[PDB]
Amino acid sequence: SMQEEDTFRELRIFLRNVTHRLAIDKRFRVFTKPVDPDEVPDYVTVIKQPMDLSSVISKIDLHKYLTVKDYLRDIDLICSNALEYNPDRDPGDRLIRHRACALRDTAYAIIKEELDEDFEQLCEEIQESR
Numbered sequence: 667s668m669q670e671e672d673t674f675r676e677l678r679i680f681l682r683n684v685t686h687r688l689a690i691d692k693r694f695r696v697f698t699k700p701v702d703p704d705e706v707p708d709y710v711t712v713i714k715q716p717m718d719l720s721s722v723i724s725k726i727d728l729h730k731y732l733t734v735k736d737y738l739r740d741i742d743l744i745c746s747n748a749l750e751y752n753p754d755r756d757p758g759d760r761l762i763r764h765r766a767c768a769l770r771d772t773a774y775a776i777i778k779e780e781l782d783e784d785f786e787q788l789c790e791e792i793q794e795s796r
């Protein structure tokens with residue numbers, strides 16, 4: 667229905683704003699664009715589901731997220747991919763892992779403070795009905 671499309675449109679607006687706030691954070695720069703296989707050689711073969719903030723925006727705009735839970739699955743993927751690809755004790759790997767975890771924690775904290783749980787419940791119920 668039109669009321670349901672208004673719900674998903676508000677969800678997209680909310681998701682774009684959260685994504686923009688992550689994207690402008692200096693700590694999260696290396697998560698703003700897809701990992702370039704030319705600059706990071708074995709990446710696209712090791713990481714099966716690459717995910718980054720520009721692809722998250724692309725997915726919002728393509729109406730791929732019908733709930734905040736679906737969006738957060740992709741945020742979790744940015745974090746888990748970095749933990750998998752950079753698992754060593756060296757400072758380089760520890761820094762990207764900390765930034766990846768911080769990106770995921772910031773997204774969850776923004777949503778905890780700003781997302782009305784009845785709004786998410788409505789999105790979940792329209793999705794489950796389709």
Ligand SMILES: Cc1nnc2c(N)cc(C(=O)N3[C@H]4Cc5ccccc5[C@@H]3CNC4=O)cn12
Pocket residue numbers: 695696697698699700701702703705706747748751752762
């Ligand atoms: C995410 C992630 N997960 N692992 C690594 C990694 N090992 C390196 C990089 C890394 O530093 N960047 C990547 C992605 C990127 C995107 C925007 C701006 C800079 C960068 C830099 C430069 N080029 C790249 O392809 C990122 N990673």
